[PDB]
Amino acid sequence: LVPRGSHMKKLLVANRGEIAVRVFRACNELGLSTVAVYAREDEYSVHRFKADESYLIGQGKKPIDAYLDIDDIIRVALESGADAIHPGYGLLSENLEFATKVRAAGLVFVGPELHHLDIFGDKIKAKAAADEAKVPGIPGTNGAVDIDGALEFAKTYGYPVMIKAALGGGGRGMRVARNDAEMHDGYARAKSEAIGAFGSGEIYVEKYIENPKHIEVQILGDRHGNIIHLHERDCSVQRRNQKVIEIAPAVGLSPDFRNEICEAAVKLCKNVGYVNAGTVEFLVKDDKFYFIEVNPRVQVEHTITELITGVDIVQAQILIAQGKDLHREIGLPAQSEIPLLGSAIQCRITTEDPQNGFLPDTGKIDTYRSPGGFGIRLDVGNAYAGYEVTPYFDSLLVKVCTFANEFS
Amino acid sequence: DSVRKMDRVLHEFRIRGVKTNIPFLINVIANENFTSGQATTTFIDNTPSLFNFPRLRDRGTKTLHYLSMITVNGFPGIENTEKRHFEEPRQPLLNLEKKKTAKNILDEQGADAVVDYVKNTKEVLLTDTTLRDAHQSLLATRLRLQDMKGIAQAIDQGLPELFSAEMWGGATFDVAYRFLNESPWYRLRKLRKLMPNTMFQMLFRGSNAVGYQNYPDNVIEEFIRVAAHEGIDVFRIFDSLNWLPQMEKSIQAVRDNGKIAEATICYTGDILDPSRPKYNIQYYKDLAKELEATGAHILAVKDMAGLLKPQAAYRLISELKDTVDLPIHLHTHDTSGNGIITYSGATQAGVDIIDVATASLAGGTSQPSMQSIYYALEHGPRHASINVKNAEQIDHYWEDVRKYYAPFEAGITSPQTEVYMHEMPGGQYTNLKSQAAAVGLGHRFDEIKQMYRKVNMMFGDIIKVTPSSKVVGDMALFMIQNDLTEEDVYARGNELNFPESVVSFFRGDLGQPVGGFPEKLQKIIVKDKAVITDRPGLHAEKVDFETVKADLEQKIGYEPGDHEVISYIMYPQVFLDYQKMQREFGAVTLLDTPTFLHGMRLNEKIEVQIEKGKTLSIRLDEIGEPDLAGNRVLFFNLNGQRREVVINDQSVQAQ
Amino acid sequence: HLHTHDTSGNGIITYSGATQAGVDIIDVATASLAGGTSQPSMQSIYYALEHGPRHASINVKNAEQIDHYWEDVRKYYAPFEAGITSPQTEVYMHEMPGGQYTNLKSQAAAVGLGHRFDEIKQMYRKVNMMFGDIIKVTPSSKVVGDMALFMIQNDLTEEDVYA
Amino acid sequence: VVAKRKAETGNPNQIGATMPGSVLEILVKAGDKVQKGQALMVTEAMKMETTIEAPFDGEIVDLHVVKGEAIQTQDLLIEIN
Ligand SMILES: Nc1ncnc2c1ncn2[C@@H]1O[C@@H]2COP(=O)(O)O[C@H]3[C@@H](O)[C@H](n4cnc5c(N)ncnc54)O[C@@H]3COP(=O)(O)O[C@H]2[C@H]1O
Numbered sequence A: 001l002v003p004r005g006s007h008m009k010k011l012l013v014a015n016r017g018e019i020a021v022r023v024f025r026a027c028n029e030l031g032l033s034t035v036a037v038y039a040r041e042d043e044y045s046v047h048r049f050k051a052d053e054s055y056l057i058g059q060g061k062k063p064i065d066a067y068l069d070i071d072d073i074i075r076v077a078l079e080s081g082a083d084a085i086h087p088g089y090g091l092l093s094e095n096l097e098f099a100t101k102v103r104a105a106g107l108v109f110v111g112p113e114l115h116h117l118d119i120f121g122d123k124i125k126a127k128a129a130a131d132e133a134k135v136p137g138i139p140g141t142n143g144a145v146d147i148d149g150a151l152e153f154a155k156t157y158g159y160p161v162m163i164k165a166a167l168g169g170g171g172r173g174m175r176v177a178r179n180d181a182e183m184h185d186g187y188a189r190a191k192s193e194a195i196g197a198f199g200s201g202e203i204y205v206e207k208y209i210e211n212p213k214h215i216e217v218q219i220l221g222d223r224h225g226n227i228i229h230l231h232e233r234d235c236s237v238q239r240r241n242q243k244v245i246e247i248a249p250a251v252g253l254s255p256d257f258r259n260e261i262c263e264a265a266v267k268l269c270k271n272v273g274y275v276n277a278g279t280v281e282f283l284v285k286d287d288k289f290y291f292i293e294v295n296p297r298v299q300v301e302h303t304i305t306e307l308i309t310g311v312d313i314v315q316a317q318i319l320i321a322q323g324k325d326l327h328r329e330i331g332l333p334a335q336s337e338i339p340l341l342g343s344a345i346q347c348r349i350t351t352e353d354p355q356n357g358f359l360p361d362t363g364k365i366d367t368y369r370s371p372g373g374f375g376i377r378l379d380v381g382n383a384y385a386g387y388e389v390t391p392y393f394d395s396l397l398v399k400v401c402t403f404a405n406e407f408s
Numbered sequence B: 001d002s003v004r005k006m007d008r009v010l011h012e013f014r015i016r017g018v019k020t021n022i023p024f025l026i027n028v029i030a031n032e033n034f035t036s037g038q039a040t041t042t043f044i045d046n047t048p049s050l051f052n053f054p055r056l057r058d059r060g061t062k063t064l065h066y067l068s069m070i071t072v073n074g075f076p077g078i079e080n081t082e083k084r085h086f087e088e089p090r091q092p093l094l095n096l097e098k099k100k101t102a103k104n105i106l107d108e109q110g111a112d113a114v115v116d117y118v119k120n121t122k123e124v125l126l127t128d129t130t131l132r133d134a135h136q137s138l139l140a141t142r143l144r145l146q147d148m149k150g151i152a153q154a155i156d157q158g159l160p161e162l163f164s165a166e167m168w169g170g171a172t173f174d175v176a177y178r179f180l181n182e183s184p185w186y187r188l189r190k191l192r193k194l195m196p197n198t199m200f201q202m203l204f205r206g207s208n209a210v211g212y213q214n215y216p217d218n219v220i221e222e223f224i225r226v227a228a229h230e231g232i233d234v235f236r237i238f239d240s241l242n243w244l245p246q247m248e249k250s251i252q253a254v255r256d257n258g259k260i261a262e263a264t265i266c267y268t269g270d271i272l273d274p275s276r277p278k279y280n281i282q283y284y285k286d287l288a289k290e291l292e293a294t295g296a297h298i299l300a301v302k303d304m305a306g307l308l309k310p311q312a313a314y315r316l317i318s319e320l321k322d323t324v325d326l327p328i329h330l331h332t333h334d335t336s337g338n339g340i341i342t343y344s345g346a347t348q349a350g351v352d353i354i355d356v357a358t359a360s361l362a363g364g365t366s367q368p369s370m371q372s373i374y375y376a377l378e379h380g381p382r383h384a385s386i387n388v389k390n391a392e393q394i395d396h397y398w399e400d401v402r403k404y405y406a407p408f409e410a411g412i413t414s415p416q417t418e419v420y421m422h423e424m425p426g427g428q429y430t431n432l433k434s435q436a437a438a439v440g441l442g443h444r445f446d447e448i449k450q451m452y453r454k455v456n457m458m459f460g461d462i463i464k465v466t467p468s469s470k471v472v473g474d475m476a477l478f479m480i481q482n483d484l485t486e487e488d489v490y491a492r493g494n495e496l497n498f499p500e501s502v503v504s505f506f507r508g509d510l511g512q513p514v515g516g517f518p519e520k521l522q523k524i525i526v527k528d529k530a531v532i533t534d535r536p537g538l539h540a541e542k543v544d545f546e547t548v549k550a551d552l553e554q555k556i557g558y559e560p561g562d563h564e565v566i567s568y569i570m571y572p573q574v575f576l577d578y579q580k581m582q583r584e585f586g587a588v589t590l591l592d593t594p595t596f597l598h599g600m601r602l603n604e605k606i607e608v609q610i611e612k613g614k615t616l617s618i619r620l621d622e623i624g625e626p627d628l629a630g631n632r633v634l635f636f637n638l639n640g641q642r643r644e645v646v647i648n649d650q651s652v653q654a655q
Numbered sequence C: 001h002l003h004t005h006d007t008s009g010n011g012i013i014t015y016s017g018a019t020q021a022g023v024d025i026i027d028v029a030t031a032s033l034a035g036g037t038s039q040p041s042m043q044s045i046y047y048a049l050e051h052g053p054r055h056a057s058i059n060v061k062n063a064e065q066i067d068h069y070w071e072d073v074r075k076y077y078a079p080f081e082a083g084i085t086s087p088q089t090e091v092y093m094h095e096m097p098g099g100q101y102t103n104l105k106s107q108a109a110a111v112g113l114g115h116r117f118d119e120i121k122q123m124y125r126k127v128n129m130m131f132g133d134i135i136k137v138t139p140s141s142k143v144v145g146d147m148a149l150f151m152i153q154n155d156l157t158e159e160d161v162y163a
Numbered sequence D: 001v002v003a004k005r006k007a008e009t010g011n012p013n014q015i016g017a018t019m020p021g022s023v024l025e026i027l028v029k030a031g032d033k034v035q036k037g038q039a040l041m042v043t044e045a046m047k048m049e050t051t052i053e054a055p056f057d058g059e060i061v062d063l064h065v066v067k068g069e070a071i072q073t074q075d076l077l078i079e080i081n
């Protein structure tokens, strides 16, 4: 069942920076015209000048609020005659309200069904869905809890434990408690950030696993019941639980084991009829794996999966949202035939100063010379000679990927 | 997909400062020989279509050329001064009421139904002249579309009670092209869309539309057809000498196009001065009856010099209302300081509609204030029909916008009762001031106003409105400049070359004046040139729209719309000069007014909206010093790129 | 002896009305220093009454000639011009005499509220009612201004004051 | 050293030298009416020869070079109206 109005001529990206440029490039390659949105303070962003047209949004608001201005973004889509909105990642890309209103305005939302944003946007509902699909999860509170249900959990399962917000993202709604006193403190502070950053503060707890790998599986689902995985990614290289370097495939794990992980992700996505791009995230410890999250959108590290499979994930997203069949029209092979070529690594180069506690630097870029060659892929954010890095947005300058037959 | 990616990449490259082979590569990968995979070693050498390269558009660069021009050399005809920091104009806080408007009625039921709506209205109705006559009087007609658009929706929604908005014709057509480098047709379309419920009114000269040549009838008819199609609802048709034959065809064509025709009587003299009986109340009644017989929908009284005193307005209107059944639409200027009281008088006499300007563009040589007449009638038997609180809010925007036009201000806005003595309408007064300057008689202007008055009597006492007012001016100037009395002119005129405009007047090129010409003086002035006594347009060189259209397309390099064709016919050189300016500077209409007039300051950033979805973010980073040949180099940032622009500094060159 | 300002654009018609009612003396300014927040024009009122039942007593031709001098002299004072001379009917809402209007403009500037002036005119009107509805002329007009300014700048509603 | 007047950037009424070289021949003079494509002058760069063509119909306003004069990139050659 394909929604009415799935044909596209023009697409608008409700985002900024590298991901917006990435989506425009796919659109242009598909013969779609593009529309950008920008906050006043972000007016020198590359993504603004890569679109076929662009519009200021969020007048008079703080810059991040401008990018979260649902009504104003919809206003631009309708005024420009866009057919579709691609939300990128971050910002409103997992936001049920936004997708609902985009669809209610007769536009295509390039992403999964509302039902999927609801159950995978909420991490409690997501663990429920994973249990239902018979995918092993991490022992955790039955649902959301007050501090007494939390302490109860720690009594049942033991310290240490991970305090997690239902709507946590990037790592902002989570705290490790190795203690009673850290449980009271951690719980309070995870609830604050969750209200502050995402407007609601529901909390659950999970068993905290020691020295795990973080392994995640890329999924595509279409509107014709096809689901496939594009192998996995190892994102274990983290700082303060934030991804720094990602690789693909997971070269330090056995192919049988990786395959098992991929099949578990597929099982879950089949069970709920997942549509469009999504990722299933697992923690891995001694040849066991545990479900933690689904990100029901594209991710920053999709790039490395494109390189080892040959599949253009963003193009796929857009074609799926146009109602196309993964195999028949988009041209992906059967699952056993998905390529697995070499390995790939992605680093994000930022203005974070490692000798100043990773505080991101600001100011004007005097010189920007980008390398190339065989096995190099660059997806630029805001970096060019003359560009003024502001304090308002993330510190990303450019994403660098390398790819080769051998990991070394 | 590999081919699509190449194509994406080639288009995405930005390389400036040297030419590249990119446009050739783009052609190669577009071709079917390449995409099939079947190309051979001889493919390129035998495919000449690969060498056709499109001209790639550069709006950005014409903009920087214009900004650099104004920044360095100033705006022509005004003082080259440094640009003030202007706040955004205030937007109004409206209390909207939804009502059916005259425009709605015209479109749903036609013109006669509008006339009936007017007859049944007890309140005096208002036409807003803010978009046309008010700035023609106060700001040398320089008000720009860009400023008009920012408040137009507010006027439409805000003041649905308006009979109409006067927004076109008079000097606006010409000035828009010639001095503002913007098309009056684009102004009409843009405002038309923003104001769908407001009747749009224009001033239209019966024989010439908006021009000053002698056009044949088919031109006048075509102008009307296009204007009407493009959104003009009410045509106020006048003739400079109140000569009815000049008006008849126009009136018929407006009716034929389904629009409203006001037939106009120009007021002059004083119906209450029995020593000037030539323009007495009977004159006006007689002419009003003839105008009624043409089938005009409304009678307009155009008091172009603001001569009408309140007792005369009362007598005139009351008599006219007992002479014809058409609604009467009165137009005056506040030049004497008696505009409100005259309108209030006319209201007591039954007047149906009056022409008013928003307060901040009212008074002086403009129309009386809209907001003021509301309050003058608030406690009388007849109110003015307007949402005054909304009108006051909207006035804020115009108060702010007016400050941008400081360099074009005629002087301080205050009364001038000497208009009763000389009878110059306002433009004639300011223009005649420039002319006496350019000839070094600025110091004798008061002798000139005195001569203007004498000349008027010498010519038989005439109606003075454009272009007949100029006829009187040129002569009066001539006569002072060559130390001539009226006696001198009658004695030794046979050996003098009189000014062009005077000669043309006395040949009948402006039509026939009331009471004919003074005979001896006519002979003296016209000498051996051809004199006519019938309608000048009967003598007009024929005009074939297909010929002219082809001629024009050749000249501008694309197929002109009907509106362009008629512009070219109306003002040929000006239209061609506008085209050249578009080609050099692009669409300057899109610039905010202070930028249009003064360019940019060092370290200033501006945003130019060049299209829906396209904005030029422009910052001026450096203004280099001129070298000895005048070369200056400015450095801009345009949408994150450094741009180096060379402009020639005229002050050095003219050293 | 009646004195008004032409701030609303109704000065001449008001003086004319007053003339029919028997007023004995009126305050007028020469044309080039008339209109706006000034008095109505001396030369204008002559001509408004010229054909009525009661005339103005003045040598109007002489007055016109003299106005020329003032028209020229006024140009020397360009830097002090309050703005463009035109009508402003909002005076009926706030009732500030002209000096109170311009001064209260400077004060809102000096405190960085120039951008909220229209809220200030609105507050000036509320304050006036709050004080019992008072006569506002110097210095009572200033009393109302200072308060209205104070009240905006410290974000206070009338009740806040009462409360 | 009195610099040569340069052609104004983005002004299509002014034709500036595209590369350094010299002026071989001048085919038109001040006042002449001229047609799009018509040859106005010939210049040399590395002894390659370029013919300067009128960008559109119009009237020559003035020349700013003389026969056999040396020219640098951006030097103003000829103005058109
Ligand atoms: N008895 C009364 N009660 C209350 N208010 C009174 C009044 N008599 C006069 N006014 C006010 O004074 C304004 C000027 O009256 P005025 O007779 O001086 O000045 C008159 C007069 O110059 C002329 N006008 C009006 N009716 C006239 C008539 N019937 N005959 C000749 N002239 C007339 O038009 C001007 C404006 O008259 P309008 O009636 O609109 O405006 C009047 C009205 O607002």
Ligand SMILES: Nc1ncnc2c1ncn2[C@@H]1O[C@H](COP(=O)(O)OP(=O)(O)O)[C@@H](O)[C@H]1O
Residues within 6 Å of the ligand: A138, A162, A168, A169, A170, A171, A172, A206, A207, A208, A209, A210, A212, A214, A238, A241, A242, A281, A283, A292, A293
């Ligand atoms: N239960 C847990 N035990 C140990 N580490 C965890 C747990 N949950 C999350 N983490 C750490 O935080 C990272 C992000 O986990 P996730 O739940 O996906 O939060 P986010 O919303 O920040 O992506 C993981 O890769 C892991 O390093």
Ligand SMILES: [Mg+2]
Residues within 6 Å of the ligand: A170, A281, A293
């Ligand atoms: Mg995660």
Ligand SMILES: [Mn+2]
Residues within 6 Å of the ligand: B133, B303, B304, B331
């Ligand atoms: Mn007029």
